[model samples]
Target: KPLNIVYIMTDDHTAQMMSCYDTRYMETPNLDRIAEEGVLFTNSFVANSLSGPSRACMITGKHSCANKFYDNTTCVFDSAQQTFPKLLQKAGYQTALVGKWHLESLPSGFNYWEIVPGQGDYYNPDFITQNNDTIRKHGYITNLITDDAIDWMEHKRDLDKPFCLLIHHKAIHRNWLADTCNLALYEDKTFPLPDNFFDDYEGRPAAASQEMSIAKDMDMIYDLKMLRPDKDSRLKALYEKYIGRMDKAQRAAWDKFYDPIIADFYRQNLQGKELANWKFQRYMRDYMKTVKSLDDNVGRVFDYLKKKGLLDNTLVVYTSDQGFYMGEHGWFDKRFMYEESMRTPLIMRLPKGFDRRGKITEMVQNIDYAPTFLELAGAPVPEDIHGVSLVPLLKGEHPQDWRTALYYHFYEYPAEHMVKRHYGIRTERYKLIHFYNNINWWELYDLQADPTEMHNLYGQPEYESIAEELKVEMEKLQEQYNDPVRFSPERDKE
Candidate 1:
């Protein structure tokens, strides 16, 4: 029998926050459950670190350079293009995608899909139907998405054929909103700041130019939920927008938890480094609380699958589209080549013949998700697919000819965070990045020695040969993957 696929994805969830990867800030028992039963891919990454671009790569199994969805603000997905879900559907698998389709174009391959329209609000979100009907659903997004997926599984999808359901969540994304019940989750607690939270971005001009710093870029009222009088009038309405979504009962619960805290925030009159660190603390609290909501709903799906006796046959996969910064380098949003934004959390559990379990330390990526699904579904993966199948890696077999390095490119620059256009290669031990299109800049890091990427080893006399070798590999990767935009002299437009 062909294997059933149950893939779960969340936005902006990073390795540092997940307990399986790091037990520092929060504990994610449901995510740990996926790792405990199967394998945790420690070296998972994304082709691009932005939301729309990352999702485009995953669906098409191609890098952003090839897929043509480089930046969110300007580009729209070519909805007519073939994707893995089409390949799976051709193989007779009933395909469905529920929640958070931010591709800017409608889903084209699935038999069923329900997506939030344009970064759907955390409260009282609207979902676009497969029939092209826009429907407003009144509830927290995470719970509503989970409920829709379960409802689809129970009553919507065809049971006769093997199914592939993509359950994506908008939780833990920007403007991190926690459910009213979870508003006070981390109220009494303080998460320790990452060691690099005070990063100066000395050598790396690209990193320095980014607008993701928690201290300077994060909002006072919207991002951290602080109710200070001195803030944007539009942002003042933003707090009310979230609060207004809940009914009286929920609003009462929310106020019961936050009113006292808001009163305290107004009294502190913090400034300079004090306000900066306070922003970090507030961001972490709300972010972790949103994570809590995501985990609880993941438990909801897990229980449903187990109750239906479908857990054994389903190939359950858990991953984020891309990682998010939790005050790492004091940054808040993604779209950089930094480890915190590029490396995502990937865990999978096989119900039947997969004997291997726990810690598969191979370099996998979002681009690989498509080919993996196709191969496991007994469908022939298209030759045009840029990523390789990871079936053997999941079984704990180290094939002699596995990938040595991964390629990454980020094009969302001078727009949203102002991160410059750059592409690079990351191997097990080193990373080589070059910023082009006006600035001829390079930053190399001996990743083994500097995992935080604080030290730029580019142009150093000691690593001259190492830089040469990595540059060659990076060029070869660009060529092998048909990345003409990076290979040619012609630059992409502004």
Candidate 2:
């Protein structure tokens, strides 16, 4: 029988935060299960790290520049274009998607889909159904998305045919709302700070001067729902229930410091050293709180698969739209072609006969997913796709011609977040990024030595030859990928 696929994806899920990867603090038992049972690619990355573009790449197996859905602002995926799901449907597999779909337009080709509108809410999110009908699901977004996914899995389509379900999670994204039951869970415990948490922003100029900090960038007025006394009676009652015993000044100071930081945001501008420390605390707590809820829900999904006896035959994959910045280079959100934001978590759990579980250090990108999915399902990949299947790697065989370098382009401007638009390339040991817009800066990182990317080596005399070589390769990659804008000047006119 053909393998049944359960592609589990999350939004803005950073690999550094997962326990399977041996981060000291967080643990994801279920996501870890996929790695344990199959292959975990340490070097897997996304072509475009933002929501809409990444999802589009996963579906179409095309780069952001080719698809034109390079940023959140642009939204036009040709419905007629061949996609992995549609190919599966054509090959007689039942297909469905549940949870975050950030595309401005409705999803096509799926037999059934329920996607959260926009970034979706942390609590009581609105979902647009297949018939274009909107419905509100009133629990935590993670649990609700899982409920809908399991519900659809339990009762939908033909039992004889293989099924491919895209179970997407809205959890661990932003605004950090845990399940109501788990809300008070992490209040007392302090999450250990990241090693680079106090980044200081000493060496990097662009990173040193960014507006995104938990203390500065996170807006209490809109982003976070901080409880206040006079604004709402419910909050007043809750404050009494939780922190009322602290008395006036303690409570006032707590309110003055923590409340405004989380709810109203600090007004005075914090820069250099002070701002870095504040961002460290804010980024870790909120990001991890959201992650804890996501991990619990992953356990829930794993339990369901095992209970139904579908664990062995099922090909389970765990991944994210893209990597996120956890105080790397003093930034919060993704969009730059830096190592922190560019790499995504990718794990594949193959069925019994094809099991290949081990870490692969070779680089892989989002474009490869489409071809890999099609090849796994015995469907013919379209000639237009620029990716190759990882089936060879999964079988523990490395074809000599496998790619040694990966190309990337980030088209989103400093819109909702302040990340500049850029494009770059990454080899096994080095990376070069070019910010094409107003801040025309080039950042080069030697991954072998400076793995944390704390220092930018673009202008450094010692590595000048290495930087030049990578730049030449980067431009060659842009040409090979059929990116005319970077190559042919006349092509831009069209």
Candidate 3:
């Protein structure tokens, strides 16, 4: 029997927040349950570290350039293109997608789709339905999305055929807003600041030039929910727009929880470094609180599958559009090719027959998802697809020809966060990144020795041999993957 697919993808969910990946932040029982029952890829990464581009890569099994959806600034996904959902539909799978579809255009190829508009709201969110009608849902974003996804499985899908349901969530995104019940959950638990929360960005100019720090870029009113009657932030109106969407009871609950914290913030009158730390703690509290609701929704979906007797034959996948920074280097958004931003959490709950239930240390990219799902659905994976099938890996067999190095490129620069356009390569131990288009800078890191990527060894004399070899390998990969951008030190001189 063909395996049904339930792919649950969240926006800006990094591995650092999940207990299975890192135990420092919070315990995610439902997210961890997938890893405990199935396989967890420790080195899972995305081709691009932005939301739209990463989803494009995952759907098409192609990099940004090939998909023609490089960044959120200028590109929109070409809906007529060859997406995995289309392929699955052709292969007799009932396809459906619910929740955040930030790809600009309406969804194509799915039998049914109900997506929230770009950067969807967290409370009383509006969803664009299959009949081209917009409806304001009267519940939290995570729960509403999960409810619709489960509803599709229950009543909408053709039960005779295998199904591929994509449950994309808007939770844990920017300006993290918890579900009403979870508003005060993590208030008492203070989170520890990251070690490099105040990174000097000593040698890397692009790193220093970002505007995404929790202290600096994260708005007090919009991001941290520090709204007060006396004080106002520049984004005060925007914050009002978000919270203003709530009804009487929801607004009452929100004010009940945050009003006191807002008072305490003014009471202390924090400044400089101390204020920065305060922002970090609040950011973590809200982020984890949002995550708690997401995990609960995930468990809801999982339990629904088990109750419907679909667990034995279905494959469940949980991942993020891209990894997000949780106070790492004092950053909040994801765009840079740093470890915290590039490496996402990928855990799969396989069906009863597939017994591979341990960690897979091989490097895998978001581009691999399309081919993996196609192979699992007994569909023909197109030769043009860049990703290799993980069927062998899922069957407890490691292919000797697995990809050694991963490639990444980010193009939404001269835009938000000011992350420049750059492409780089990451082998097991070394990473070489070039920040180009307005500034030409190279950053090199030895992953084993400098895991935090605090030091750059690009032009150093001692690592000349390893750097040269990595450059060659990078060039080889560029040509192999048909990437448009090819960087070399010689390009700097020219």
CA lDDT scores, all candidates in order? 0.86, 0.75, 0.89
- Candidate 2: residue pairs that collide: 38-357, 220-263
lDDT of 1 by residue, 1-494 (tens): 68899999999998888899998888999888878888899899998898899889988999877788988888989988879898898999999999988888899889899998878888888789898899999889999999999999999888889999999999888888788778868867776678988888989988777787888878777776666555564366867776667778877877787778778887788887788888888888889999999999998998899899898889999888889888888888888788988899999877878888878888988899999999999999988888999998977789999999999988876687788888899999999988884467999998888999999989889999999999899889988777775545355432
The lDDT ranking, best first, is 3, 1, 2
Clashing residue pairs, backbone N/CA/C < 3 A, model 1: none
Give the backbone clash total of model 2. Answer: 2
Best by TM-score: 3
Worst 10-residue lDDT window for candidate 3 reads 485-494
> Candidate 3 residues 281-332, lDDT tens each?
8999999999999999999999999899998899999999988988889899
**Which sections of candidate 3 miss by over 4 Å?**
487-494
Clash number for each model: 0, 2, 0
* Tens digits of lDDT, candidate 2, 231-289: 44323453344343344654554455456445433455667666555445555665677
What TM-score quantifies how close candidate 3 is to the native fold? 0.97
Which candidate wins on lDDT?
Answer: 3
